[PDB]
PDB file of C-alpha atoms and ligand atoms in Angstrom:
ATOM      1  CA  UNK I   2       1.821 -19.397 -16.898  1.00  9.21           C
ATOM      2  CA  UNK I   3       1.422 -18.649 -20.881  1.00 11.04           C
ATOM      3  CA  UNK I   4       3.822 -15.696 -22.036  1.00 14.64           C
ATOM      4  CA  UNK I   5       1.248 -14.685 -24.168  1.00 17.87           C
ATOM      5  CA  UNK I   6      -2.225 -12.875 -23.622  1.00 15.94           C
ATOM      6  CA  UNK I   7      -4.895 -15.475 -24.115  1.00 14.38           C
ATOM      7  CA  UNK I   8      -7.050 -13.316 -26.191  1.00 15.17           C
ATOM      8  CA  UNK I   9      -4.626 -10.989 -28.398  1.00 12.91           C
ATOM      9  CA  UNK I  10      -2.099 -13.845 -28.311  1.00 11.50           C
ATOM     10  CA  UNK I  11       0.363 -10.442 -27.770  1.00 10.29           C
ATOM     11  CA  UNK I  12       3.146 -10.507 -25.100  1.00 10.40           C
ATOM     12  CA  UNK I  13       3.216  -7.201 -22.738  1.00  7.61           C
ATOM     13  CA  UNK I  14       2.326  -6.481 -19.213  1.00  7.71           C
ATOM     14  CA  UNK I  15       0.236  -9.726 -18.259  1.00 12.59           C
ATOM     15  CA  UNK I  16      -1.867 -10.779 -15.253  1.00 14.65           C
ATOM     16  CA  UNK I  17      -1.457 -14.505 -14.478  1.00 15.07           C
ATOM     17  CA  UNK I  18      -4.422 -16.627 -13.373  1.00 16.76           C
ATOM     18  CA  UNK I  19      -3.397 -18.541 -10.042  1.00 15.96           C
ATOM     19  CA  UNK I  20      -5.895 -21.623 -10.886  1.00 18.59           C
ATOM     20  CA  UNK I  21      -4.875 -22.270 -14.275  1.00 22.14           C
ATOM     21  CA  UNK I  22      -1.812 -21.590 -17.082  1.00 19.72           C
ATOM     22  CA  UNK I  23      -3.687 -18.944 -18.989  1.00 23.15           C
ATOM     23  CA  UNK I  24      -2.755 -15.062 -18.995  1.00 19.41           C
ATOM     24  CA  UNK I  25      -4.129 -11.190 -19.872  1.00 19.46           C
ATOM     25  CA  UNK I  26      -3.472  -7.974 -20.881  1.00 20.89           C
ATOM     26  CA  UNK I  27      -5.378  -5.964 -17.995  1.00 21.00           C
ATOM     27  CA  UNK I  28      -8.294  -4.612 -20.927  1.00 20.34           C
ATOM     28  CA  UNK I  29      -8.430  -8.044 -22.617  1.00 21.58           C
ATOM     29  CA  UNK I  30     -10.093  -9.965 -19.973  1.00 19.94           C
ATOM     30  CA  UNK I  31     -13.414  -9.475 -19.421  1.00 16.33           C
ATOM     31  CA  UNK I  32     -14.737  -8.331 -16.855  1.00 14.71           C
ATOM     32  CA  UNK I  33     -11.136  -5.830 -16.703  1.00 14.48           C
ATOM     33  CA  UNK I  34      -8.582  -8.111 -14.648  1.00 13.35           C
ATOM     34  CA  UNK I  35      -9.470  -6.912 -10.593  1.00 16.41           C
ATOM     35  CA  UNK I  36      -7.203  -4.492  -8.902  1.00 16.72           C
ATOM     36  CA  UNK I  37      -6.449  -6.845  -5.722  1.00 15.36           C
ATOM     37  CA  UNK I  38      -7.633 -10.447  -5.471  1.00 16.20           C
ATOM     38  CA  UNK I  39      -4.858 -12.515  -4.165  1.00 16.29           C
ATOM     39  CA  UNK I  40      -5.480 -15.825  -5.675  1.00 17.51           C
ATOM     40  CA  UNK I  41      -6.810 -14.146  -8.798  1.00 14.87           C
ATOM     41  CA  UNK I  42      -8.688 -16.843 -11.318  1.00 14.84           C
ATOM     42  CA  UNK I  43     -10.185 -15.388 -14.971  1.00 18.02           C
ATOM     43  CA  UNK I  44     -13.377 -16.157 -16.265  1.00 18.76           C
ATOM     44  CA  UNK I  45     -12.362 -19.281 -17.442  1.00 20.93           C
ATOM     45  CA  UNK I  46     -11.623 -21.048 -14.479  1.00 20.84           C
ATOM     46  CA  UNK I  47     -14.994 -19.230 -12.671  1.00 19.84           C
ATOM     47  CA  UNK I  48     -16.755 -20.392 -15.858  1.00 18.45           C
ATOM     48  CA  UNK I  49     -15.423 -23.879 -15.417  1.00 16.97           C
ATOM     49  CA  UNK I  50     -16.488 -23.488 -11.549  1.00 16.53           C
ATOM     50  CA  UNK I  51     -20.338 -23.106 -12.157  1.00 15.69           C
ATOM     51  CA  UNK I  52     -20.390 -26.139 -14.123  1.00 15.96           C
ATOM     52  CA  UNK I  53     -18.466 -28.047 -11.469  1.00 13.05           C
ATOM     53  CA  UNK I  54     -21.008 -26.766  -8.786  1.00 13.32           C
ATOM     54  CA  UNK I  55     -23.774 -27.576 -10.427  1.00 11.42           C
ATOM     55  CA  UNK I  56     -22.814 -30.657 -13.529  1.00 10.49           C
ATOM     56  CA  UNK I  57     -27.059 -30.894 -14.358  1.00  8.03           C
ATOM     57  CA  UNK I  58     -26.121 -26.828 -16.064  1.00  7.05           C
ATOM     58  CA  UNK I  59     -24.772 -28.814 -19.021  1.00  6.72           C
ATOM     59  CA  UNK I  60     -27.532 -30.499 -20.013  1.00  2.00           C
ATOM     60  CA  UNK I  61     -29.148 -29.211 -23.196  1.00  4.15           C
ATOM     61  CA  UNK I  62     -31.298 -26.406 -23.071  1.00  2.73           C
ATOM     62  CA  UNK I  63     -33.844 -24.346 -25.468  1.00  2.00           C
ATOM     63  CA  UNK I  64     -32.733 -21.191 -26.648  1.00  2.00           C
ATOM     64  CA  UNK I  65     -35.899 -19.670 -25.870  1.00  2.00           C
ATOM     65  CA  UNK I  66     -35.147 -19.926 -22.446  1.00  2.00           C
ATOM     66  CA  UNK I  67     -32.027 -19.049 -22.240  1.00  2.00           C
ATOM     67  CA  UNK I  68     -32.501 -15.720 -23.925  1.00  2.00           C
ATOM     68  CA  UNK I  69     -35.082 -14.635 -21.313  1.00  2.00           C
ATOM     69  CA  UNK I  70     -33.209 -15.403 -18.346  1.00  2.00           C
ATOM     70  CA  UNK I  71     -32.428 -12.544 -15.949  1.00  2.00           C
ATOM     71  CA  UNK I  72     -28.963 -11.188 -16.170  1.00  2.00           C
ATOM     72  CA  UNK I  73     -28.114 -12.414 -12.691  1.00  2.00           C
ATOM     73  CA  UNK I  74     -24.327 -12.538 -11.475  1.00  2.00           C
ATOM     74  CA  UNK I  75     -23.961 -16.174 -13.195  1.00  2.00           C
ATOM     75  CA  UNK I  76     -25.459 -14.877 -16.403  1.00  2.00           C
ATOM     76  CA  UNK I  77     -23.545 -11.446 -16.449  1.00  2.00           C
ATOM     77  CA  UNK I  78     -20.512 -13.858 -16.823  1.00  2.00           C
ATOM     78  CA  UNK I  79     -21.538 -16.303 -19.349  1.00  2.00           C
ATOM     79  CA  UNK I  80     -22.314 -13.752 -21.469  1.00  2.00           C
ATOM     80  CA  UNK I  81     -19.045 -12.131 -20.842  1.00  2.00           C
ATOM     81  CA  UNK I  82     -16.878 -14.987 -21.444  1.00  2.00           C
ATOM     82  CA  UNK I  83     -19.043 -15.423 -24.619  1.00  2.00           C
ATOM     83  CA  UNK I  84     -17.620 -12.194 -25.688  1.00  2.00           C
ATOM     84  CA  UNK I  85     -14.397 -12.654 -24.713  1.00  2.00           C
ATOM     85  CA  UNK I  86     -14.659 -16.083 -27.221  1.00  2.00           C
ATOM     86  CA  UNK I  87     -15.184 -13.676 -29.893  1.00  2.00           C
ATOM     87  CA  UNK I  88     -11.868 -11.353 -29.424  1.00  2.00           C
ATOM     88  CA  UNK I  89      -9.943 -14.279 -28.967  1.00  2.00           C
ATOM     89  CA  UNK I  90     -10.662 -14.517 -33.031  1.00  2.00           C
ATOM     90  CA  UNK I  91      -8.398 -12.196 -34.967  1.00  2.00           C
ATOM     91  CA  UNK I  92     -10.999 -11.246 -37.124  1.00  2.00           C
ATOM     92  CA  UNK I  93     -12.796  -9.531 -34.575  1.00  2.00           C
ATOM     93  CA  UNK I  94     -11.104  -6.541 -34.981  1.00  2.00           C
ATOM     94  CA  UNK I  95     -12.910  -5.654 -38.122  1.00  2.00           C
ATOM     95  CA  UNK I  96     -16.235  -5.132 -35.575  1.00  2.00           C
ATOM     96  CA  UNK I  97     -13.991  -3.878 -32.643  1.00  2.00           C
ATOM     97  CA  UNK I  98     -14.862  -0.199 -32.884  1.00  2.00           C
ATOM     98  CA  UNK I  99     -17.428   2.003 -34.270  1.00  2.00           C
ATOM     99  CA  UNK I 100     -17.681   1.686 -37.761  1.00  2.00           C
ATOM    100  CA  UNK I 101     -19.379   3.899 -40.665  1.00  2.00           C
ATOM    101  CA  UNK I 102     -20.719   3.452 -43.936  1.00  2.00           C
ATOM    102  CA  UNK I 103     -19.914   5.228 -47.492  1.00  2.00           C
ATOM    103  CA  UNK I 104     -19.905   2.961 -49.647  1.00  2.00           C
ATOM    104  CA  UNK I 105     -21.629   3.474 -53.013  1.00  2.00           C
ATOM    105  CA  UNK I 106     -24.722   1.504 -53.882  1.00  2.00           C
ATOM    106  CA  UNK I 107     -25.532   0.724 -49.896  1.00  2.00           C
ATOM    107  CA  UNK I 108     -26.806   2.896 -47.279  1.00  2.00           C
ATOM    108  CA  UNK I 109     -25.828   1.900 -43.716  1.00  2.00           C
ATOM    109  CA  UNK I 110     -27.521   0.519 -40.786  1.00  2.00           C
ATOM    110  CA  UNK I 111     -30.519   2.300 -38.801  1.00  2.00           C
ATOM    111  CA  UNK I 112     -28.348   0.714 -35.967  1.00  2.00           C
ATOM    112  CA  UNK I 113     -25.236   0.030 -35.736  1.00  2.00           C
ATOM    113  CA  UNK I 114     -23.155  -2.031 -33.077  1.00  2.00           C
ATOM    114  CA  UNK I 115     -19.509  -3.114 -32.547  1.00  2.00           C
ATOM    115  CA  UNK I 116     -18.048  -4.951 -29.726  1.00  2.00           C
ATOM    116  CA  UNK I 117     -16.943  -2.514 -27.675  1.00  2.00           C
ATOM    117  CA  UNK I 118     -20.207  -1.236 -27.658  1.00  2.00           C
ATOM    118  CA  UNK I 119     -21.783  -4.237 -26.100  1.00  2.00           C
ATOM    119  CA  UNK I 120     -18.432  -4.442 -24.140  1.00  2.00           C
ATOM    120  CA  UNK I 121     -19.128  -1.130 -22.399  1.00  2.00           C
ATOM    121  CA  UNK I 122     -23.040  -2.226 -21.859  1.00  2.00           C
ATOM    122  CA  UNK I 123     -22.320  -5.236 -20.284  1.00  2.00           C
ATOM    123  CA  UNK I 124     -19.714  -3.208 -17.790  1.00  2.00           C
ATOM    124  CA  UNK I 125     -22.343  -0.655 -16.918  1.00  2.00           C
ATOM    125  CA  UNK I 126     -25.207  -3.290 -16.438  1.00  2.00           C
ATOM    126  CA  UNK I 127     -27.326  -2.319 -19.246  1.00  2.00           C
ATOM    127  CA  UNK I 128     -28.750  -5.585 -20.212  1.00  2.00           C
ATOM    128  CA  UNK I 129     -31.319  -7.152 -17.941  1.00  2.00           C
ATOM    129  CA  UNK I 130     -32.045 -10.526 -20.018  1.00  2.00           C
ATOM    130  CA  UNK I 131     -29.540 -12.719 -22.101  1.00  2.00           C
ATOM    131  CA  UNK I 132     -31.590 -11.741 -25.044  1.00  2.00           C
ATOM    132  CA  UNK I 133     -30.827  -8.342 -24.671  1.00  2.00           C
ATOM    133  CA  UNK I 134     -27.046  -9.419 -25.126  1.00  2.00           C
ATOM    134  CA  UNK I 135     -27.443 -11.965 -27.688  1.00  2.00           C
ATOM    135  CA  UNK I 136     -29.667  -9.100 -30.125  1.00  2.00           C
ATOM    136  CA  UNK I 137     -26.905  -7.058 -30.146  1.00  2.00           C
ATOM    137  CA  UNK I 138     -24.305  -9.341 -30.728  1.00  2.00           C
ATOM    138  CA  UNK I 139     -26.572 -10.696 -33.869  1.00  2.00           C
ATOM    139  CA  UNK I 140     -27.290  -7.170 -35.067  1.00  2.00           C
ATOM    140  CA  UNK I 141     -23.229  -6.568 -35.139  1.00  2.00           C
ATOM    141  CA  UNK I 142     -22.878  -9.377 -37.951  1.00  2.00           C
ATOM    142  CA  UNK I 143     -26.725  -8.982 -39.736  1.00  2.00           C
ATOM    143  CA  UNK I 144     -25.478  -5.009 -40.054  1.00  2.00           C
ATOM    144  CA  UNK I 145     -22.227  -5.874 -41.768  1.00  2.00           C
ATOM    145  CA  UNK I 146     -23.625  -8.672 -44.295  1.00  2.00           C
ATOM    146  CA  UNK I 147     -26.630  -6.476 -45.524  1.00  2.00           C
ATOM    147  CA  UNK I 148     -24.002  -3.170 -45.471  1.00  2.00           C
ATOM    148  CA  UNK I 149     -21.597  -5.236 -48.064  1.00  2.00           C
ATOM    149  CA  UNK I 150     -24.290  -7.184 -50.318  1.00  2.00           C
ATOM    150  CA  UNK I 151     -22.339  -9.195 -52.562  1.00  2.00           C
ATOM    151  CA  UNK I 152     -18.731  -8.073 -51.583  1.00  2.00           C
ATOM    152  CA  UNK I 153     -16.320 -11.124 -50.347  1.00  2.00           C
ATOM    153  CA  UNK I 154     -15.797  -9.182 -47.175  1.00  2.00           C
ATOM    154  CA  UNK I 155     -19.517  -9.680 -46.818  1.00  2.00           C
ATOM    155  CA  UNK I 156     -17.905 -13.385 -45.523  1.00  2.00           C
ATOM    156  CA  UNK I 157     -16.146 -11.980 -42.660  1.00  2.00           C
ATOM    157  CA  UNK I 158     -19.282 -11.314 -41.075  1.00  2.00           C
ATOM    158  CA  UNK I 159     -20.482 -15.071 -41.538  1.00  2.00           C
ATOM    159  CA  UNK I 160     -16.999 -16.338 -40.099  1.00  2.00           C
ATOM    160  CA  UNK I 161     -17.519 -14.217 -36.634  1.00  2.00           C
ATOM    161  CA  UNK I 162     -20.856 -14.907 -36.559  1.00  2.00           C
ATOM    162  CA  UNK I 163     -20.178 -18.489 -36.272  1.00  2.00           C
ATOM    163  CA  UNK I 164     -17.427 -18.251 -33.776  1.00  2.00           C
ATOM    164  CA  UNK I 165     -20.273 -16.396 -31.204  1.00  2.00           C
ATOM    165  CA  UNK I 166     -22.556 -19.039 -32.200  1.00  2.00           C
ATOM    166  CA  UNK I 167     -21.063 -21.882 -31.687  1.00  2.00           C
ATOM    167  CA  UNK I 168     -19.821 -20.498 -28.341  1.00  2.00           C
ATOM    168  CA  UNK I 169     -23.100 -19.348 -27.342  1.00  2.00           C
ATOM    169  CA  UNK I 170     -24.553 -23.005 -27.892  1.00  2.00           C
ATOM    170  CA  UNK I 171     -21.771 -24.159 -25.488  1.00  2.00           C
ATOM    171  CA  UNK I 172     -22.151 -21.774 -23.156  1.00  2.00           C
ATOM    172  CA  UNK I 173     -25.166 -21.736 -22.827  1.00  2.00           C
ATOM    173  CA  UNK I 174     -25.799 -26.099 -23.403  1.00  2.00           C
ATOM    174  CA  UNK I 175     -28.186 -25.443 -26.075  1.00  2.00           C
ATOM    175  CA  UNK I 176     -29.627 -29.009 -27.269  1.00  2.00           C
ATOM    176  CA  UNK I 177     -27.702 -30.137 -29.329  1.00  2.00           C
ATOM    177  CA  UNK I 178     -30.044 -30.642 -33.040  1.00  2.00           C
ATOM    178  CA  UNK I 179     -29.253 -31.605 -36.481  1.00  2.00           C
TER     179      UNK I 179
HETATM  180 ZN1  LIG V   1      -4.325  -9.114 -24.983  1.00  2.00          ZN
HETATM  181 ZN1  LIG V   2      -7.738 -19.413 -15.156  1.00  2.00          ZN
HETATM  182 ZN1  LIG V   3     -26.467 -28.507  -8.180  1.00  2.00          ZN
END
C-alpha cells in the first residue's frame, strides 16, 4: 500500500484498502473509513465495482437526468466519491470550512456553503436527488466568484469548479459534447 493518504497526500495513521494500493487518514475518506470490515475496499474500488457489474452505466448520459435521480445507495456514493475528487485538490482548502465576508465594496452571499457543509449533509442523508448535491456544490464556487468580483483569487473558484466538473461528467458518464 501507498505511505501516503490518497487525498491529503499526508503520512499519519492510515487505513489500507485490501483490493487496491491506495490509503486514508480515517476523516479523509468518504464515507469515514468503517470501524470493522475485514477485507476493507474504499470508494474507489466500490466505485470501480458498479461499473464492472453493470459496463452499459458508462455510456453517456444527460445531465438532466442524472440530477433528478433518487439518492439511492449507488448514488449516495457517486456523489461521495465526487467529493472526495475535490479534496484530493489542494486548493480545496480555501472552501473547506465556513467562511465569512468583510471585504469592502462586496456584500456576501444570502447563502453560503463550504465542503464540509455538504460533507456533513451527505453523512446525515439530507439530500434526496443528485441535484440536491450538485446545487450546493455549484453554489460553493458561484458564492466565491461573485464575493471577489475582479480580485485574482476570484480564479481559485474557477480552478475547483472545474476539478468537480470534470469529475462529475465522469462520474456520472455525461455525453460527452463539444
Ligand atoms: Zn488525509
Ligand atoms: Zn481501493
Ligand atoms: Zn447490468
Amino acid at each position: 500500500n501507498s505511505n501516503i493518504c490518497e487525498v491529503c497526500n499526508k503520512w499519519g495513521r492510515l487505513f489500507c484498502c485490501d483490493t487496491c494500493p491506495r490509503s486514508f487518514h480515517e476523516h479523509c475518506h468518504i464515507p469515514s473509513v468503517e470501524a470493522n470490515k475485514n477485507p476493507w475496499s474504499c470508494i474507489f474500488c466500490r466505485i470501480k465495482t458498479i461499473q464492472e457489474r453493470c459496463p452499459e452505466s458508462q455510456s453517456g448520459h444527460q445531465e438532466s437526468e442524472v440530477l433528478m435521480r433518487q439518492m439511492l445507495p449507488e448514488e449516495q456514493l457517486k456523489c461521495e466519491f465526487l467529493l472526495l475528487k475535490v479534496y484530493c485538490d489542494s486548493k480545496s482548502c480555501f472552501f473547506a470550512s465556513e467562511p465569512y465576508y468583510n471585504r469592502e465594496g462586496s456584500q456576501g452571499p444570502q447563502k453560503p456553503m463550504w465542503l464540509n457543509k455538504v460533507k456533513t449533509s451527505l453523512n446525515e442523508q439530507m439530500y434526496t436527488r443528485v441535484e440536491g448535491f450538485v446545487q450546493d456544490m455549484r453554489l460553493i464556487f458561484h458564492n466565491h466568484k461573485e464575493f471577489y468580483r475582479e480580485d485574482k483569487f476570484t480564479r481559485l473558484g474557477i480552478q475547483v469548479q472545474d476539478i468537480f466538473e470534470k469529475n462529475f461528467r465522469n462520474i456520472f458518464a455525461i455525453q460527452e459534447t463539444s
